[PDB]
Each structure stands twice: as C-alpha cells, then as structure tokens.
Design a protein around this ligand. Structure first.
Ligand SMILES: *C(=N)c1cc(=O)[nH]c(=O)n1[C@@H]1O[C@H](COP(=O)(O)O)[C@@H](O)[C@H]1O
Ligand SMILES: *C(=N)c1cc(=O)[nH]c(=O)n1[C@@H]1O[C@H](COP(=O)(O)O)[C@@H](O)[C@H]1O
Lengths: 257, 257
C-alpha cells in the first residue's frame, strides 16, 4: 500500500535528507525539480527566487556557470532556505572512488560544501559510492544512483539497473534513491527522480527523449520529475513551472488514491 | 601484424590528433601518460616540466585544481608544446548530449579550449559522443570511449564493451580510441589507453586494481599506460616516470617483435 510523501518522511530507515525533501514536497504540494543549466549566476539566482515556491528541488549545473563563485552558492543556499527547496548538483560522477572523492570535495567548486544531493553512475562499481560517501557522510549529504537514463541508446538497462539497485541498498546510509525512468526499487525509503520529462511528445536533436508527468509519476511510479527546457524555454517560466508542478502533483495524488 | 607507433601514425584512416600523438611516442620512445591529480597549479606545472620529456601525454584533473585559471592552462600548453606531449582532461563525461556539449565547451574551465583529448562514458548512448563532437571536431580534438574500467565491480563488460567499440567505429571522425584494460578493437587506427597500472601488485582502499605495464602492454595488447599514484607518490617523480616509461616501451617493443 502506497504511502504519502509525508508518511514516507517518517519511515524508520529514511535518510535525513530524504525526510527533509519529502516533508517540503508535501507542505508545498510539489514534486518538481527544476534543472537550470544557465551560463550566468545572476540567471540562476533569478530563476531560483522566481520559481522557488513551485519546486521541491533545484538542479544546478556548476560546470556550466561562467561566473561561479562560492559567494553565489552562499546566496543560493539562502534562497533555498527561504523558499524551501533542496540543491542537487547535476554532475554525473563516474570515476574510481579515489578520484570521485576529490572531485566531490575539492577544486574550485567544492560541491559537497553546498549540494544537498549529488548523483553518481554505477558503472565503476561500488567504489564510486564508497569514495563519495567518505566526503558526503561527514557533511550530512545524500546521493542518487543513476539506474536508468532517458537518452537514446542508454546502456543503463537490465542487469545494469539491477546492479544500481543492489548498490543503493547496500549503501543506504548515503544513497537516498535513484535517477531512473520508473520505480526500480520496492523500498519506500528510496526516492525516484525522473528526467526526460515534457508535457508534449518529443525529444531533442542530441538523443534526449521525453515522457509526460502523468506517464512517469502516474504510470511508471516515480516520485519527482526533473524538468529543464520544458520550463526554461517557455515564454512564461512561472506559469510553465506551475503547469509541471500541477501535473506531477495530481499524478502522485491519483496513484495514492 | 603489429605496426610501430610511427607506422600507425601513417594509417589512412588516422585522426590528426592520433597521428600527432603516435609520432611523438615514436620520437621520444614513450607510451606513458602521467595522471596528475594534484590540488595545486604550481605542482602540476612543475611535474609537467620535469616529466614532460618522459611522457606522451599528461592527464589533467581540472575538477581537483584548487587554483585553476585559464593562465595556468596557457602555461601548460607552452610546456606541452616544448616537451611534446598531449593534454588529456580526465573528466569522464557521462550525460545526455545537450548537457555534455556545454560541460565541454563552457563554464569556467572551457575544457575544449586547452585539452587535446577527452574521455566519455558510453552509458548514455551515442548522443554523448555527438554532443562532444559538435564542440571538438573543428578544434582537431579527439575523444576516447570508456570501454572497460579498472575498478572492482565495473559494469563495463560484455555487451557494454561491445557497444563502446561500435560507437567508436560509427564516430571515427572524432573518436580516436578507448580507455580499456586490454585491446578491444582490432582496428590499428584506434588507441588503447589503460589505467590501473603500477609496477607492484595491489590496489587501493576504494576499489582500484593494478596490473603491471608488462601485463597491460605486452600481454593484453594496450598501447599506453596511464599512471597516477605509482609516479605521483614517489619521492622522485622523475625517476619513477622513467621506470614506467622503460617498462611500457620495452613491453611494446617486445610485442612488436
Ligand atoms: C541527469 N539528471 C540526467 C540523467 C538522464 O538520464 N537524463 C537527463 O536528462 N539528465 C539530466 O536532466 C536534465 C534534463 O533536462 P531537459 O528537461 O532540459 O532535457 C539535464 O540536466 C540532463 O543533464
Ligand atoms: C579514467 N581515465 C579512468 C578509468 C578507469 O577505469 N580507471 C581509472 O583509474 N581511471 C583514471 O585513471 C587514473 C588512474 O590513477 P592511479 O594510477 O593513481 O590509480 C585515476 O585517477 C582515474 O580517475
């Protein structure tokens, strides 16, 4: 029997980051994550402020920001706290444990110092998680494992997806869920976040494929939709974000019955 | 049916960046790539200068460099030109095409502006290559596809590896080879670069596994060894690099007959 986001937030085995997210999802009636791959910090902050009320999460793309500074991230965190959303950095970590540890904690970006959530590919084996968690656990962070991908020709299928689920299960102190196209775990303590979402059928010219909020939340049993271009390329970004929120939310309610 | 690096540089279907690399390998008697995952620009540049004569390539880790600037990369280019080595950025690109295009071209790092070579994971499908290609093709860059990984529990096996080989074949205007543990393609135009190499048996505490240069180059038929810690952790990094160079080069010569 399907549990509400609010109830899931209270599960004995829930990770604190997942609980915080689930609570604000229920409070705000939003299971939308905005993906903002903008080139200017000012753009990022403007979008975060304007759309913050409509979202549960903001997916940043630090590697694309032309004018990144740590002061920008300080201000973003202030917005996140005010509007109540989490920060999820997009970078798809995908290296041996020793290297990913450094990529997560260090450099100019210091991702672990401001991202509530990160995502990682499972292709390197479990060392990728072990490396990340050595940084993430002290900093009270969570991780999502990429169990499936939305793009044409994805190899994240079959036994690969099953491996991701096992890895998650075995690292539940740090791993809080999946990037996936559907529900892949039966355990309610895990979140499912699904990119490749737009209201209309289609794709892009570089292998992205889209499904609707109703399809992925309602039929496929995911929790949260990740939407970038469907919102950002709209004339009215506020209205677009509202449209996606209402879609995703109603699909969730329906499933919940 | 084995050809020298110098002869391979002349193959009809060879990419210009590959030919450049194969010529300097032959000239300098080196098939060693130094992986320099240091936190400081001064260390990176000192290593590049001192070890430059001993290496065919320097693998940078821009995501870990605390004091990155584009001026640092300008100086590195100068050293690469002087000592004759290629610059290979480590970042293991692993996203949809539209996103990796921006990650490669833009942000603070502007990777495509200074890296001869990049590597990508094949998990997203061929859009990952198409996105990178749209940026790197006119710059005379090349890309390596991650066909196998050196770490424990790697999922880059079997059909996944085969998919990487097919993807390379289908994008040979831009894909110049593989990150792999062994020869994966029979086509001599493709380069095989193998990480997880040390003179001594072992591993690390985060899933890395090591094999020797003699094993990797001599028995497994790879072209280039990628060595980080085996060199970087030595007291005398130059002497270490020389040891690795001689091992890899003589293993190559021996297979050549
Ligand atoms: C990573 N979150 C990811 C994984 C995936 O399989 N597919 C995918 O699109 N993403 C990322 O999500 C957004 C989607 O943006 P659009 O709605 O604009 O297509 C983008 O950040 C991808 O990198
Ligand atoms: C990526 N080049 C890669 C792929 C892989 O399967 N294994 C692997 O180690 N690498 C990277 O190569 C260096 C090896 O460094 P050490 O010699 O210090 O182990 C490493 O930093 C990985 O990121």
């Amino acid at each position: 029997m399907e549990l509400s986001f609010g109830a899931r937030a209270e599960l004995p085995r829930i990770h604190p980051v997942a609980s915080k997210l689930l609570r604000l999802m229920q409070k705000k009636e939003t299971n939308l994550c905005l993906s903002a791959d903008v080139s200017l910090a000012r753009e990022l902050l403007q979008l975060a402020d304007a759309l913050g009320p409509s979202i549960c999460m903001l997916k940043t793309h630090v590697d694309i920001l032309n004018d990144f500074t740590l002061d920008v991230m300080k201000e973003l965190i202030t917005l996140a706290k005010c509007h109540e959303f989490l920060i999820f950095e997009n970078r798809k970590f995908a290296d041996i444990g020793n290297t990913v540890k450094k990529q997560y904690e260090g450099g100019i970006f210091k991702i672990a110092s401001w991202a509530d959530l990160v995502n990682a590919h499972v292709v390197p084996g479990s060392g990728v998680v072990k490396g990340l968690q050595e940084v993430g656990l002290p900093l009270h962070r969570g991780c999502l494992l990429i169990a499936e991908m939305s793009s044409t020709g994805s190899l994240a299928t079959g036994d690969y997806t099953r491996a991701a689920v096992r890895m998650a299960e075995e690292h539940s102190e740090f791993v809080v869920g999946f990037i996936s196209g559907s529900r892949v775990s039966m355990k309610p303590e895990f979140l499912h976040l699904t990119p490749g979402v737009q209201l209309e059928a289609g794709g892009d010219n570089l292998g992205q494929q889209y499904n609707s909020p109703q399809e992925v939340i309602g039929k496929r049993g995911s929790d949260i939709i990740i939407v970038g271009r469907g919102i950002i390329s709209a004339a009215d970004r506020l209205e677009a974000a509202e449209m996606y929120r209402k879609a995703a939310w109603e699909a969730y309610l329906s499933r919940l019955g």
